[PDB]
Amino acid sequence: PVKKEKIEE
Amino acid sequence: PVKKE
Amino acid sequence: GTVNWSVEDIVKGINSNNLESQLQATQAARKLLSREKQPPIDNIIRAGLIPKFVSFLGKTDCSPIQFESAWALTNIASGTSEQTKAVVDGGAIPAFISLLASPHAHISEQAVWALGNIAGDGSAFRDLVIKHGAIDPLLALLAVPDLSTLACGYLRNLTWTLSNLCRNKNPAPPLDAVEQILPTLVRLLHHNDPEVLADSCWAISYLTDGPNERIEMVVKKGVVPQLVKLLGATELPIVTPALRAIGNIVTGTDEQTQKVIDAGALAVFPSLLTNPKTNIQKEATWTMSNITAGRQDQIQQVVNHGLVPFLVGVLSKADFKTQKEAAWAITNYTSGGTVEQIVYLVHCGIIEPLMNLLSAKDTKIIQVILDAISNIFQAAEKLGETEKLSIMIEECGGLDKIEALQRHENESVYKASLNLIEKYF
For this UniProt entry, which segments traverse the membrane (chain C)? Predict the structure, then answer.
């Protein structure tokens, strides 16, 4: 989606 | 005919 | 207690000369930037933290600060172009490419993700990522006998990043970079994970969105059969990109279009042209339009697959945008078809739905439909059936609409309308 935030891991 | 994008 | 820190506290930690204090503060920043509500990216940038995070990427001795800084920088790079630029301007690209070689998979993966965000901004950063030599190390991560041994998340991130290196135009990616990537993409198009398949299809869609030479590079890799298979998948996230790619390919040469036909694509179109998702119906109808623009033998395969009734269907009832693509498909069919093929189209019920669309508030569709009527009349002239056609048009309410159109703003419309009435009515 063009760009992706990493929210959790 | 001609194709189109 | 690396939760809910202030930026001031993060700065104080990062400016400490204590690697552990710096690590705690870097993790606090990561957690800030990982919150869903307005992550404070601009405050972090304004604090001057990007250069520090980038330097932490190079601390091989402290793997956790590498990870935390990588994730922090990933989330900044996820934002606006300006926010992505700040990461690039900090020297992150070469530092992330170095991290692709990390023995720690979680760090390699984060570097993959960050480079995807950077390449995803646009052509210029994509090309800068390529110039700094990202492709070789990225592909090396996928040089395994069986992709199924790789962790699911890792493989999905790599596929997504590679798709962003394939993306954007003006300009399109460098030809040599596309040649380097395509063999790995072909392999990922055969992987069994739905998300890998979707992102692989998106990549092919991007690489096929251009001149015939770009299409040829993909088509010569032999992927069209696999794309047609994916066109028949249950998952919409796969079908959407597969159909876009197929649609892109049929905008090329008649020989490239034939590969799609030979691969069995037209057998999926009954479903596609009746699909509940409007976008799929639109794009499938657009695809049909570029097949009806082909050779007469190609029009015949449309006929043989039973697809003219489906085009009558979409013309009769669909979202307006789909109906306009269908009008184009008819005008193209009528322009390039044999007399027998045009007769078939009328026997399938094209006239009434075409006439019903002449009531539309769109100049282009009226032009398209008027052109198609002319083409059909031309075939009727060759059969001496002009009057039968004239009657059909009159009986379904057409003559009324064409008459009105002689009195229409657009010149092409009134000219085309006046001519038809003058010659047939």
Answer: none
